[PDB]
Each structure stands twice: as structure tokens, then as C-alpha cells.
Design a binder for this molecule. Structure first.
Ligand SMILES: Cc1ncsc1-c1ccc(CNC(=O)[C@@H]2C[C@@H](O)CN2C(=O)[C@@H](NC(=O)COCCOCCOCCNC(=O)C[C@@H]2N=C(c3ccc(Cl)cc3)c3c(sc(C)c3C)-n3c(C)nnc32)C(C)(C)C)cc1
Ligand SMILES: [Zn+2]
Ligand SMILES: [Zn+2]
Ligand SMILES: [Zn+2]
Lengths: 97, 114, 104, 627, 146, 73
């Protein structure tokens, strides 16, 4: 599929890639298990436990990482907001990718 | 013009002998400016107020601004004694500075008059 | 140049690397590629000032010189709705709480 | 969506997760609803609050894996009449369920080992367990089917290549996380079967065919075995199977092969020789007996051929025999067996044995014969060759005589011979001599020709300093006249030998005495090479006497010419008169007197001049004997 | 992590664009690294050092390791051709993970580690982060894998 | 008796002459080599690294003689 349809639980529908994050072998291997195959392959992702602004910032960061993974251009730093640090800590400790 | 001096020729020869790899391995930092702002030595130059080095001696000998080899001896003494007064008497820095000055003198012990 | 964009409309989500010298019409074509809705019925606006497909990424002021690297560039999305273009509607995201009693 | 946290129900979550795992692994395409809900349920289970639910969810997953292994084992155990095909198909089904491995369980991959570790690998362990449940009990059936298929293919039937390949691959492919699985699973039984087959085949063939037939059949069988090993195995053990077959067939029969190899080499059955050489090349002990036999045969053939040499043309016969033998052996060996350096060394040893075979009761004059052969090839009286042909002959002779014993003796003989051939006026080309010397100096080293260099520098130093003195005379004050041209060489005088020390002081004719004296007077200035003794035995010339019956002077040596210049005092002289005039010893005086009397130059011993001397040629020379 | 005591001059100052104050680690006779004066983001620092020295770049006010010239450390070379060169500073693969661990360690003092509305995994597992000897030894652990 | 000819070949020559003068500082044999000059008994090339000065009565060992008449050896 063109995109990877990632949607959290609370209403919205969104698209994000994994190859775009391949530097995130986290993504490369988290799309990395039991057979999930259909003729209309579009990378649909339905989850019920993710924050919305967190997901948007994470998508921006994923684009950054997929542009900078072995890229030699200028790079910015990691932008975060002071509202979700603890949730991010737990989420990372779970993800590690 | 300058009528060449035997002392000046012997000084060029001494600079050559210094150009051997043996001396630069310990006076190589002195073959160029021992920075006063290199390590924060805002007082290093205040203590030693006669900027000089192996390159300083080479320049003062090639430019023909020196009168004789006594000037080279005085400049070497000034530089070495400034280094020593900068360093203490219980150090490898004193050892190296004394080695360099004494070697200069002993090697000068073989140049006759002209 | 790399202009950072992120369009929120209804419950949608899309992102790419937007050319500053390229066309907002190119942005509409990309939106068509991503959504099945060619730029014909698409409608993107920087705030409220309508950015015609001729206005490039720099036509809105968002480029790699000021584009957020840890957060996307603000983008509004309005699509074609039958005989008229439904106005741009983007509601607010989740509500943030305050800090703990010892961490603020 | 932007989903807030939640509390998960273990039982319903496990039911939902299983309802997706079944539809995914079971070779079925399920709804996008389940596709999207699987990961959400997994996350909801892994995100229990305010405590962990790993132990429980992971336990459920492990039970699922064990159930998969056991159920696959049972379903395969239903495979009585289709054991091999069923094993291959079930392995392929599990492999496809894993080849969908780009879907969900990256969290299982990298969120358990790093939760209770730095207890196994998850997907690899699942494959290993599925092998244990079906493969671990069915290894007997799987190996038996593989061996039966291999035997049937060896009998003439068509095997199942893809099924064999996959069934062999999976067991080694069990653990990724290197040769553990496969190198411990198949290599041993495969090599054992190959060794048994090779032993039986070799035992039968050794009596069922001759040497050449056995070698050809063995080469074909080895090619077929390599093909079969490539079809049914990876490159980790193909070498093992090939080497086992080689040890069984081309190794165990080394003694019989060498016993037949004597006749094989003596018969030069190019095909059989190539087969034996190839079969023995990779073997540690295949070379030695054949190499020894071949070298002995070559040396014996060369010696036998050279024994028939004709007395007149001994050097030519030796050169021809050596060239023929070397060419034939080199061509055969290098064409048949990849050019063994051991073969080159054996050829060198055989050639050395042939060349250095000196007959008892005589001294081995091979170096002198070679030097004389080179001199004759360079001779200007033996037509039949060109300059390029001579250069080629010298190039061949260098590589042929590389193994001649008497190096120093050959060098001294050549030096003396060339010294004579240049003293006589026969060296038609110092350049051709220098080409032969170029061969001899590219071969025999620098000291090999330092002597030649000195002798040449002597021909020059004489030439050079004497010419300088003659030029000084040409710029001198007084007049001079010659009447007869001459040439000489006394330079740095230690290059070529004429080593006979003098015995009697020489008194030669004043004719050349004046030339010698003037030469010394002009020459004694500023040079020094040799300061040796007299090497001037080569004195001779001519004079035209208008007082005889007609003017006729023939070649006469220095002693005879000096005696005749003593005849510039009296035509009739006794033996003592000629002896004193010549200053020569008794032997030389007698030889010269006899030669002058018998040569028609003259007619208690007394001698007289000849006034009617004549011969068949008006220009004839009283010969020097040493030639 | 023990610097080479060559005493052979290496005339280089590394252009280090570290957004905080630039006080990287150093080398002692046995390997003791110490902070250094402030080199801010964008400008370079100039000092003559000893040939054979390995050092990298970090955040002067963050204390976390950012790969030395993006590698382990700017490496030791002698003085030949007399040209300037440096092992500059730069982030590792700029990690939101490290960013969040350090952000927790910052918005809560080092004594505020095991106190989330969660269980005691965040502090150690993720925010047991910036330290000089740690960063050095862990980079060396990478280089021991290498 | 008659001989109106000119065409002999003849020879007499060869005048050998060793090195000449007194060359003592360390300066080994003027006609031989120095210690290392002619300590090379497998050699005679002293005769080409020889002992002479010029046309002006000089001589010495080969190397320390050159750097320390006959064109001889
Ligand atoms: C102002 C500033 N702003 C932003 S950064 C900065 C700044 C930058 C550099 C410095 C000074 N440099 C250093 O501290 C360097 C930077 C880094 O490469 C590490 N470092 C060191 O000096 C280290 N040193 C070494 O690896 C070599 O260790 C020998 C320890 O002694 C170093 C100096 O002792 C402390 C102060 N004393 C001096 O500098 C005396 C000086 N020493 C020396 C000297 C020092 C060491 C050696 Cl091996 C030989 C000679 C000296 C000279 S002239 C000259 C060219 C030199 C190098 N000299 C003479 C003559 N007399 N006194 C001197 C360290 C941390 C162990 C002290 C100060 C401030
Ligand atoms: Zn002497
Ligand atoms: Zn020498
Ligand atoms: Zn004189």
C-alpha cells in the first residue's frame, strides 16, 4: 500500500510508514512476526492505548529519523512537550525500538 | 652589506645540528611559539617577556640582524632561563631545559674563532 | 527545500516532505496519491488565507529554515464535498492534565 | 484515534488473540477488522496496570507454541503412506506461517528476552520445538525416507529434489538467534552412506575393469557424485562426501595403482597418464612412486639413446638426445598433469643423471664437449646454420647444461679455446662470440665472466696503450717506416689462459724485434694491467726474397723466420747456428728444423738453405703442430 | 579509555556544534577524564593536545554521550603536514528515548526517580542514564563488541 | 739469398709495474690494499680500486688513498 494506516482508539484515522523508519529497526522488526497478509495490503494499524498529540509528534520524529538514518545533512534535536514525559518513559521501556 | 662571520657560519651549523631529529623530540614545542593563550597563561608572557624559540634563533641568524654568535648565545640563555624560571627546580621540565642549555654550550665548545 | 507539513482535518492524518519551491498543486497531487482524492477536490489552507496550488511551500512561510523538526508544520485540510467545498474543520486534540504534586 | 490507557481482561484477550493467530498461521486470509484488532489486543494485554501481565500472556503464548508443535507432530503421524511428502508439506506450511513473519510479534521478539535476560529465542525456539514435536520423534522416518530416495535415485529413478532440499534445510535452519544444526544432523549419515557406496563400487571395479577403464569410470562416477551432492546438500559437506569417495576409491588402491603405473608410464597412454595424475594429485601419497618411476625411465631412455653416439659428432649427438628427451618429457607432463613443480625437479634430476654419467676408466669430458660444440656452432667453416639459429642453440644449450658437473673445467677450456681462435685470426665476429658470452654470462654469473672481461680488456689495453704510444710516435720527432702491417694484444693480461710458463729465453728475428723494441719504447708511460710472463708463442709472418728462383714466401712461424733472418748472415748453417739464432730449446729446434726441411723450404747434423723449394701452392705455410 | 601519553603534538581543535556548553571528557596518566572550560554551540575550542589521544563530545549541561565525532572519540594522530583537524562533536542517533530518560531525570531530580504513577522500572531501566564514567565505559563496551 | 719483404707480425712488450709511493697514515699497502683495501683475498679489484694519485707521483690504498704516475695495478 502507499501508506501505513495507523489509527489509535479515539476516533481519528492516520497513516504512517515503517520502511520510512527502517533506521528504527524497531519499526523494521516490530512489523516482524506472525503472518498478516491480504490482497489489499495497506498497513492498517488499530490500537486503543496511544495518545494523539504523542502519535503526531512521533510521526514527525519518524520522518526525521527516516530522513537522517545515514543521511549527512543538518539535523534538529528531539522536540517534546512537558505533559507526557512519564507516559513516554513507560512506553519506551515497553517498546525499546 | 655584511662580511660573513665565522661565528655566524658556526651558528648556522649549530642550527643544522639542532635540525636533527634528536633535539626536536624534546625542544620541538620550543621550535615554535609556546602559547601564552595556549593553556590560559595570561601570566606566562608576563613572567617571560622575551618571546623567542628555535625558530626565533633561526630567524635572527638568517635575517642578518645579529652581530655575532655571542648574540645567539645570549638569546639561547634568555629563552632557556625564562623557561627555567617559569618551571620549578624539582621537575622533568628543569631536567629537559638544563639538558638543552648544557648541550648547546657543550656543542658550542668546538667552534673556533674566525 | 524541506517544508514540514502535517494536516489535521476531521479525524485524518497525513505527512510528507513538502517542497518549498514546488507547487501547492504538487501537495494536492500528493494528497490525492495518499487519500484517493486528487488535488481537484482537495483544499489546503495555511491558517485561513487560501494558498492556491501555485503558492509553493514558502508561500505559507513554513520551510526547512523554520519548519519544526520535532513537530510537524501546521496544515489545514478541506476536501471537496459534492457541489461545494466543505469548510475547513479541525477540532482540538486530547486534553492535557497538570503536573504531579512534586514535579512542577 | 488517540486511545487512553485501559484495563485488560486476560481471558477475553487471550481468546481474541488466538482467534487471530489461528486465522493467520492456518494459511487463511482474515478480515481487516481482525488484522487491526490483533495488535491492539496484544498491546492491551502487555500494558496491564498497575502491575505486569507478561508472565500470564507469555505463558499463554508458550502453551500455544507447544500445542502447535504437538498438533503438527500428531497430524504428521497420520502420514503413514506419505511420510516424506507430508513432512515436506507441513514444514513448508510452518515456514510460510513464519514467512508472514513481517506482521505482529516484533514485541515478542524484543520485549521478553530484555525483560528477564541480558529463557530462549522466541521464533527460533518455536521452530526448534515444532521440530522436536514432529522432527524430534520422526527423525527415524525422515532419515529413512531420505536414504531410500537416495538409493532409488542411484538405481535409476527420479528423486524429489525440492522436498529433499527443504527437509534437509529445516533442521539446520532451526536456530538463528553456525554449523551446529546441519553439520550435526546430516553430514555424518550422508558421508557414511557415500563411503559404503564408494567402497563397494571400488571393490567391484578394481576387478571388473582394467586400469584405464577403472580410472575413466571413477572420473565419471566422481562427477556424478559431485552433481548429486550439489543437488542434495549445501557446500558445507560436499567436500566431505567427495573426499570420502576419493579416499575409498583413489586412496585405498594406491598400491595397485602404482604397480600398474610403471607400465602406464612406460606405455605413455596419454589418457591413462592424465587420469592417474589427476586421481593422485589431491592425494598425499599419490605422487612419489609414479614420479620416481617416470624419472628413472626418462633417465634410462636418455642414457641408452646417448650410448649410440658416433665418434665424429659426439657433441651434436649429445645435444640432440638431450633436447629430444627434455622436449618429449616436458610436453607430456605439462600437457597431462597441470605442470607439477615436482615434475620439473624430477626432470632436472633425470637430465643431471644423463649428463653427468661419466664412463669408468675415463674422465667425464662433458663440459669440454659442450664448449667445443658451441665453438663449432660458432665456427665459420661449418655452414648449415644462421646467426639466429646459433643464438637459439646457445639458449637451449644453457638450459641443457645447467646440470653439468665440471663448471670450472668447462669455463677454463672455453677460455683457452676462444683465446686460440682469436689468436689465429678466425674470430669472424667478436659480436657473435659476445652473444655466446651473453648466454654464458646470463647463466654463469658475474665471476663466471670476470675472466673473459679481463682478457678482453687485455686485447684492448694492448690495443689501447700501444695505439696511444704509436699515435705519440705519429706526433713524435723522428721519421718511421713499416713495410709490413702487424697487430698485437698485451693489455690487462689475466682473462684467458695460455698457462705454460717459459723455459728458454727467446731470440727471435730482428725483423719483428725492431717492432717489439719500438713498441716498448713508445708504450712504457702510464698504464698497468697484467705484468705476467711471456705469452708470445704466436710469432710469425712473411718476407719476399727476390734472390731465390722467384719471389715466394709462405707462412712461416717466428722460429723459422728468425732462423731465416739468421740466414740474413749465411745461407748455410749447422744445427748449432740455427739453435743459437733462434734461442729455442732442443725439442722446438728439432721440430722447426724437420718442418722446414720437409716443407720444401730447405734441403753431427748439418742444414742448408733451399734454392729450388716448391709446392702445389705457391702460398703454403709450415704448420704449427699444436692445432 | 586510557589516553595515550605520546607527548607528540596534535595541532587540532574540533569544531563542535554542541548546543550546550562544550566541556568534553579528557585523558589522564591512567585515564582520568575531567570536564573542561565552556565552548558553546557553534564555535570551536582551541588547545594543543598529545598525539594518540581519543576523546569525544558530550553535553556540558546534559552529561550524556554524543558519539565522539559521532564515533567513539576523535582519535590520536601525530603531527605531519602541519594541518589542523579535529574529532568534532555530534549527537548519537538522536534518540527520543534518551531524550525522554534525560527529561525525566531533569524534570525530577536524581532523588525523584522511583516515583511515577507507575511501577519502579522507568528510573533504572531507562533514566539510569548520563554519567561521565558510565558514558565512557559504555562507549568502550560498544568498542569491545568492536 | 733474398728478402725484400716487410710482412712479419712479431711482438715484444708488457712492462709490469706495481704501485709507487709511501702512503703511511693508516693507509695500507700502496701496491697491495689497506686492511679493508685488500683484505678481500677472493679479490684483485684493488687493481681497479687502485693505488695512485695522478700523473704527479701520488699513490695510496684505493678508497682512503683516493680520499687520502702509474695507471697500474
Ligand atoms: C581558557 C579556556 N577557555 C575555554 S577552554 C580554555 C582553556 C583551554 C586550555 C587550557 C589549558 N590546557 C589544558 O588544560 C589541556 C586541555 C586538554 O588537552 C587537557 N589539558 C591538560 O593540560 C591536561 N594535561 C596533559 O594531558 C599533560 O599533562 C601534564 C600536566 O600539566 C599540564 C599543565 O599543568 C597545569 C598548569 N601549568 C602549566 O601550564 C605550566 C606550563 N606547562 C607546559 C607544559 C605542560 C605539559 C607538558 Cl607534558 C609539557 C609542558 C608548557 C610550558 S610552555 C608550553 C608550550 C607548555 C606546554 N610551560 C613552561 C615553559 N613553564 N610552564 C609551562 C591535564 C588535564 C592533565 C592538566 C586552559 C583553559
Ligand atoms: Zn699503506
Ligand atoms: Zn672497496
Ligand atoms: Zn713527483
Amino acid at each position: 500500500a502507499m501508506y501505513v494506516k495507523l489509527i489509535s482508539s479515539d476516533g481519528h484515522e492516520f497513516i504512517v510508514k515503517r520502511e520510512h523508519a527502517l533506521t528504527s529497526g524497531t519499526i523494521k522488526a516490530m512489523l516482524s512476526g506472525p503472518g498478516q497478509f491480504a490482497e489489499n495490503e495497506t498497513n492498517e494499524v488499530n490500537f486503543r492505548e496511544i495518545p494523539s498529540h504523542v502519535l503526531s509528534k512521533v510521526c514527525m520524529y519518524f520522518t526525521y529519523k527516516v530522513r537522517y538514518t545515514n543521511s549527512s545533512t543538518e539535523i534538529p534535536e528531539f522536540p517534546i512537550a512537558p505533559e507526557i514525559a512519564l507516559e513516554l518513559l513507560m512506553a519506551a521501556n515497553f517498546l525499546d525500538c | 652589506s655584511s662580511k660573513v662571520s665565522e661565528q655566524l657560519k658556526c651558528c648556522s651549523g649549530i642550527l643544522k645540528e639542532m635540525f636533527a631529529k634528536k633535539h626536536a623530540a624534546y625542544a620541538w614545542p620550543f621550535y615554535k611559539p609556546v602559547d601564552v593563550e595556549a593553556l590560559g597563561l595570561h601570566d606566562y608572557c608576563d613572567i617571560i617577556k622575551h618571546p623567542m624559540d628555535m625558530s626565533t634563533i633561526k630567524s635572527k641568524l638568517e635575517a642578518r640582524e645579529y652581530r655575532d654568535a655571542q648574540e645567539f648565545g645570549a638569546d639561547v640563555r634568555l629563552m632557556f632561563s625564562n623557561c627555567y624560571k617559569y618551571n620549578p627546580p624539582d621537575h622533568e621540565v628543569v631536567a629537559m631545559a638544563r639538558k638543552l642549555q648544557d648541550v648547546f654550550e657543550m656543542r658550542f665548545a668546538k667552534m673556533p674563532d674566525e | 527545500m524541506d517544508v514540514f507539513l502535517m494536516i489535521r482535518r476531521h479525524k485524518t492524518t497525513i505527512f510528507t516532505d513538502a517542497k518549498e519551491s514546488s507547487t501547492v498543486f504538487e501537495l494536492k497531487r500528493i494528497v490525492e496519491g495518499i487519500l484517493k482524492r486528487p488535488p481537484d477536490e482537495q483544499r489546503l489552507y495555511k491558517d485561513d488565507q487560501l494558498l492556491d496550488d501555485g503558492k509553493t511551500l514558502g508561500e505559507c512561510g513554513f520551510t526547512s529554515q523554520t519548519a519544526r523538526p520535532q513537530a510537524p508544520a501546521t496544515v489545514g485540510l478541506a476536501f471537496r464535498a459534492d457541489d461545494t467545498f466543505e469548510a475547513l474543520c479541525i477540532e482540538p486534540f486530547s486534553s492535557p492534565p497538570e503536573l504531579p504534586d512534586v514535579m512542577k | 484515534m488517540s486511545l487512553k490507557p485501559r484495563v485488560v481482561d486476560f481471558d477475553e484477550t487471550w481468546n481474541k488473540l488466538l482467534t487471530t493467530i489461528k486465522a493467520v498461521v492456518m494459511l487463511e486470509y482474515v478480515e481487516r477488522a481482525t488484522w487491526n484488532d490483533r495488535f491492539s489486543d496484544i498491546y492491551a494485554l502487555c500494558v496491564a496496570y498497575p502491575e505486569p501481565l507478561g508472565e500470564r500472556l507469555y505463558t499463554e503464548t508458550k502453551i500455544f507454541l507447544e500445542n502447535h508443535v504437538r498438533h503438527l507432530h500428531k497430524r504428521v503421524l497420520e502420514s503413514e503412506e506419505q511420510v516424506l511428502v507430508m513432512y515436506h508439506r507441513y514444514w513448508e506450511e510452518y515456514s510460510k506461517g513464519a514467512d508472514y513473519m513481517d506482521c505482529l510479534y516484533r514485541y515478542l521478539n524484543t520485549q521478553f528476552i530484555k525483560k528477564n535476560k541480558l529463557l530462549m529465542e522466541i521464533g527460533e525456539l518455536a521452530l526448534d520445538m515444532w521440530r522436536k514435536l514432529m522432527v524430534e520423534p520422526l527423525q527415524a522416518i525422515l532419515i529413512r525416507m531420505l536414504l531410500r530416495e537416495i538409493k532409488n535415485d542411484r538405481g535409476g529413478e527420479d528423486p524429489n529434489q525440492k522436498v529433499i532440499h527443504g527437509v534437509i534445510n529445516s533442521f539446520v535452519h532451526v536456530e538463528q538467534y553456525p554449523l551446529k544444526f546441519y553439520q550435526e544432523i546430516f553430514e555424518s549419515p550422508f558421508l557414511t552412506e557415500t563411503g559404503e557406496y564408494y567402497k563397494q563400487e571400488a571393490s567391484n571395479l578394481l576387478q571388473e575393469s582394467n586400469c584405464s577403464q577403472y580410472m575413466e569410470k571413477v572420473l565419471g562416477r566422481l562427477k556424478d557424485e559431485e552433481i548429486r551432492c550439489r543437488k542434495y546438500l549445501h557446500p558445507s559437506s560436499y567436500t566431505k562426501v567427495i573426499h570420502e569417495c576419493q579416499q575409498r576409491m583413489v586412496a585405498d588402491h594406491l598400491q595397485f595403482l602404482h604397480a600398474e603405473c610403471h607400465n602406464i608410464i612406460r606405455q605413455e597412454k596419454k589418457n591413462d597418464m592424465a587420469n592417474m595424475y589427476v586421481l593422485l594429485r589431491a592425494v598425499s601419497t599419490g605422487l612419489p612412486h609414479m614420479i620416481q618411476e617416470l624419472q628413472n625411465h626418462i633417465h634410462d631412455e636418455g642414457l641408452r639413446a646417448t650410448s649410440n653416439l658416433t665418434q665424429e659428432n659426439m657433441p651434436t649427438l649429445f645435444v640432440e638426445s638431450v633436447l629430444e628427451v627434455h622436449g618429449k618429457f616436458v610436453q607430456l607432463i605439462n600437457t597431462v598433469l597441470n605442470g607439477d613443480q615436482h615434475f620439473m625437479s624430477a626432470l632436472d634430476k633425470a637430465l643431471t643423471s644423463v649428463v653427468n654419467y661419466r664412463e669408468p676408466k675415463s674422465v667425464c669430458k662433458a663440459p669440454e664437449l659442450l664448449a667445443k660444440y658451441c665453438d663449432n656452432l660458432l665456427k665459420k667453416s661449418a655452414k648449415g646454420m644462421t646467426e639466429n639459429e646459433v643464438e637459439d642453440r646457445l639458449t637451449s644449450f644453457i638450459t641443457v647444461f645447467k646440470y653439468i658437473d665440471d663448471k670450472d673445467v668447462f669455463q677454463k677450456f672455453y677460455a683457452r679455446m676462444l683465446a686460440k681462435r682469436l689468436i689465429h685470426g678466425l674470430s669472424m665476429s667478436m659480436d657473435s662470440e659476445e652473444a655466446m658470452i651473453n648466454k654464458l654470462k646470463q647463466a654463469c654469473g658475474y665471476e663466471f665472466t670476470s675472466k673473459l672481461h679481463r682478457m678482453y680488456t687485455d686485447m684492448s689495453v694492448s690495443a689501447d696503450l700501444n695505439n696511444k704510444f704509436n699515435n705519440f710516435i705519429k706526433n713524435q720527432d723522428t721519421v718511421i717506416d713499416l713495410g709490413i702491417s702487424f697487430q698485437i694484444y698485451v693489455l690487462q693480461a689475466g682473462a684467458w689462459p695460455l698457462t705454460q710458463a717459459p723455459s728458454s729465453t727467446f731470440a727471435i728475428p730482428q725483423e719483428l724485434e725492431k717492432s717489439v723494441q719500438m713498441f716498448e719504447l713508445f708504450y712504457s708511460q702510464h698504464f698497468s694491467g697484467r705484468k705476467l710472463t711471456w705469452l708470445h708463442y704466436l710469432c710469425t709472418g712473411e718476407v719476399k726474397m727476390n734472390y731465390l728462383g722467384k719471389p715466394y714466401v709462405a707462412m712461416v712461424t717466428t722460429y723459422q723466420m728468425a732462423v731465416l733472418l739468421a740466414f740474413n748472415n749465411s745461407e748455410t748453417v749447422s744445427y748449432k747456428e740455427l739453435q743459437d739464432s733462434t734461442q729455442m730449446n732442443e725439442k722446438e729446434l728439432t721440430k722447426t728444423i724437420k718442418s722446414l726441411l720437409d716443407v720444401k723450404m730447405i734441403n753431427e747434423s748439418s742444414f742448408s738453405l733451399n734454392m729450388n723449394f716448391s709446392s702445389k701452392r705457391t702460398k703454403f705455410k709450415i704448420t704449427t703442430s699444436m692445432q | 579509555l586510557r589516553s595515550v601519553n605520546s607527548r607528540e603534538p596534535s595541532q587540532v581543535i574540533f569544531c563542535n556544534r554542541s548546543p550546550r556548553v562544550v566541556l568534553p571528557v579528557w585523558l589522564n596518566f591512567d585515564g582520568e577524564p575531567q570536564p573542561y572550560p565552556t565552548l558553546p554551540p557553534g564555535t570551536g575550542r582551541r588547545i594543543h593536545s598529545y598525539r594518540g589521544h581519543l576523546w569525544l563530545f558530550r553535553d556540558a549541561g546534559t552529561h550524556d554521550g554524543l558519539l565522539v565525532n559521532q564515533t567513539e572519540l576523535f582519535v590520536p594522530s601525530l603531527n605531519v603536514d602541519g594541518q589542523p583537524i579535529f574529532a568534532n562533536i555530534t549527537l548519537p542517533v538522536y534518540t527520543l528515548k534518551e531524550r525522554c530518560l534525560q527529561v525525566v531525570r531533569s524534570l525530577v531530580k536524581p532523588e525523584n526517580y522511583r516515583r511515577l504513577d507507575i511501577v519502579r522500572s522507568l528510573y533504572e531501566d531507562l533514566e539510569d542514564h548520563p554519567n561521565v564514567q558510565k558514558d565512557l565505559e559504555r562507549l568502550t563496551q560498544e568498542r569491545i563488541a568492536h | 739469398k733474398r728478402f725484400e719483404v716487410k710482412k712479419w707480425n712479431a711482438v715484444a712488450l708488457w712492462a709490469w709495474d706495481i704501485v709507487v709511493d709511501n702512503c703511511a697514515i693508516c693507509r695500507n699497502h700502496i701496491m697491495d690494499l689497506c686492511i679493508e683495501c685488500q683484505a678481500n683475498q677472493a679479490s684483485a679489484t684493488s687493481e681497479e680500486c687502485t693505488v695512485a694519485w695522478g700523473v704527479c707521483n701520488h699513490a695510496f690504498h684505493f678508497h682512503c688513498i683516493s680520499r687520502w704516475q702509474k695507471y697500474g695495478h
